[PDB]
Amino acid sequence: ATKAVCVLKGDGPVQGIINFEQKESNGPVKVWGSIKGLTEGLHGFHVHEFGDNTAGCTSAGPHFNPLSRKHGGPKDEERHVGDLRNVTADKDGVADVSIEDSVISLSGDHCIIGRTLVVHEKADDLGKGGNEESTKTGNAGSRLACGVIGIAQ
Amino acid sequence: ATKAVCVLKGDGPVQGIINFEQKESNGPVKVWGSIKGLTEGLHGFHVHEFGDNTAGCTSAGPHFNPLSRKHGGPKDEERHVGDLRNVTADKDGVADVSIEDSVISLSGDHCIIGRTLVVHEKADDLGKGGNEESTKTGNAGSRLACGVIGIAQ
Ligand SMILES: [Cu+2]
Ligand SMILES: [Cu+2]
Ligand SMILES: [Zn+2]
Ligand SMILES: [Zn+2]
Ligand SMILES: [Zn+2]
Ligand SMILES: [Zn+2]
């Protein structure tokens, strides 16, 4: 098995810890943890290409997308590797994240270790918003908090 | 070439940005950047095993050491993979870091991407301090600042 972890922080109140676990090569990756400080409702949740937080979340680059495909929803064939399910914050601003994704990986060509996890202002429109930015980013608005994805024990 | 970057943070005083570049596979890695907030003189500088900042720098684990070797200086055959040269801070508390290291790597068995870079309170004693902790950690004191090493553009 491989494990990874990410501490999300930013300039507002959003903060969280997200865990990743993959039992075997090419297997499903479990992604779970809690993010607080969010507005009630859906928030885009992405793996961005670069683990570069020198300019805060801005320096993380675009969605992780090694084959230069269009933005999609997590269940789509045509998606970026970094296109994870929106997270849902409750009335108290807390998202209890629980995702299983078999497109991301903790090894190989879809490895996300050393890349940046970002939680967004608004819901990701799953690439179905009907405009060019929908097909690139999902129109999830600003990058509220982020962190680099690290190897965990 | 592969590139990586690390933003070093702690609890306020010590902050820095460190760049990594490896022009070829199995080639030397250039390590350079600036750390501020330090006391003048030598400070330990290590790659620790885990990219886990959930408990600040304390959760980074031991020195990166895949073959379970003893701690050493960077020019020693017997060293940890993570045993980088001490950095030197000037009279204004700034270390202008400039290292070339052929033991760390940005791919393969010695890959440091997704691990934690740490700058320390005191000088690393190069494993020559004559005690068991010398042979384990170099007796560099507290972890002043750290960050996860991320893939850079
Ligand atoms: Cu995103
Ligand atoms: Cu250290
Ligand atoms: Zn299997
Ligand atoms: Zn792919
Ligand atoms: Zn995308
Ligand atoms: Zn060591």
Side-chain angles (χ1 to χ4, degrees):
Chain A
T2 300
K3 292 179 182 191
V5 69
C6 184
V7 178
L8 300 168
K9 295 194 171 288
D11 297 327
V14 177
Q15 58 196 287
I17 294 175
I18 296 299
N19 302 288
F20 301 78
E21 184 166 342
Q22 187 178 36
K23 179 102 301 206
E24 66 173 339
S25 284
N26 206 31
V29 182
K30 296 173 164 46
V31 181
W32 78 101
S34 184
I35 312 168
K36 70 181 198 180
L38 287 164
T39 55
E40 183 180 16
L42 294 175
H43 294 272
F45 193 56
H46 304 148
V47 183
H48 284 247
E49 185 176 359
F50 305 118
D52 183 341
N53 295 170
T54 58
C57 303
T58 303
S59 44
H63 301 183
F64 176 48
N65 183 23
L67 295 180
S68 304
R69 301 203 298 201
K70 289 188 142 188
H71 181 78
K75 85 189 188 192
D76 291 335
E77 313 190 338
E78 181 91 348
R79 57 169 272 191
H80 300 146
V81 173
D83 291 348
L84 305 177
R85 186 191 177 175
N86 285 303
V87 302
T88 300
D90 68 15
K91 64 185 158 29
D92 298 317
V94 179
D96 289 319
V97 181
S98 183
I99 287 169
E100 186 186 92
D101 189 288
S102 285
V103 176
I104 62 173
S105 195
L106 306 182
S107 66
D109 290 332
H110 288 188
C111 193
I112 61 172
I113 287 171
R115 306 194 188 270
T116 292
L117 188 64
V118 178
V119 61
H120 280 269
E121 180 190 5
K122 308 187 191 166
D124 182 323
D125 71 16
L126 315 182
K128 302 293 169 189
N131 51 227
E132 297 80 353
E133 290 298 330
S134 176
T135 73
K136 193 170 184 179
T137 70
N139 291 306
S142 66
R143 300 181 185 177
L144 300 181
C146 61
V148 179
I149 300 168
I151 295 168
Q153 182 170 233
Chain B
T2 303
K3 293 175 178 194
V5 68
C6 181
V7 175
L8 299 166
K9 297 216 176 281
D11 62 359
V14 178
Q15 309 161 35
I17 293 172
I18 300 292
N19 304 288
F20 303 80
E21 188 188 20
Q22 190 177 32
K23 190 175 195 189
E24 294 186 279
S25 102
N26 290 302
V29 181
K30 292 173 165 181
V31 182
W32 82 100
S34 34
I35 308 174
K36 68 187 187 174
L38 293 165
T39 53
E40 184 275 336
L42 289 169
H43 296 267
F45 192 55
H46 304 143
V47 182
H48 285 249
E49 187 176 359
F50 301 117
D52 182 337
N53 192 54
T54 57
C57 305
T58 41
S59 42
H63 299 186
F64 179 45
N65 184 24
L67 289 180
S68 306
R69 303 200 297 227
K70 300 196 177 176
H71 182 80
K75 299 175 302 300
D76 292 334
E77 285 285 319
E78 193 158 15
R79 55 175 270 194
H80 300 146
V81 173
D83 292 345
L84 309 176
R85 187 200 300 166
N86 281 309
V87 301
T88 293
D90 72 15
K91 63 182 172 69
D92 295 308
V94 180
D96 289 322
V97 177
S98 181
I99 289 171
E100 202 153 293
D101 190 286
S102 285
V103 176
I104 59 169
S105 189
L106 306 180
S107 64
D109 294 326
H110 289 191
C111 190
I112 63 177
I113 288 167
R115 300 190 192 274
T116 290
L117 185 65
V118 178
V119 63
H120 278 270
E121 175 191 12
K122 309 193 285 203
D124 188 310
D125 73 14
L126 317 177
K128 305 307 193 19
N131 52 61
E132 294 86 350
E133 290 298 330
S134 184
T135 71
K136 283 193 60 165
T137 70
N139 290 304
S142 66
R143 300 181 184 175
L144 297 180
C146 60
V148 182
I149 303 166
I151 298 166
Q153 188 174 49

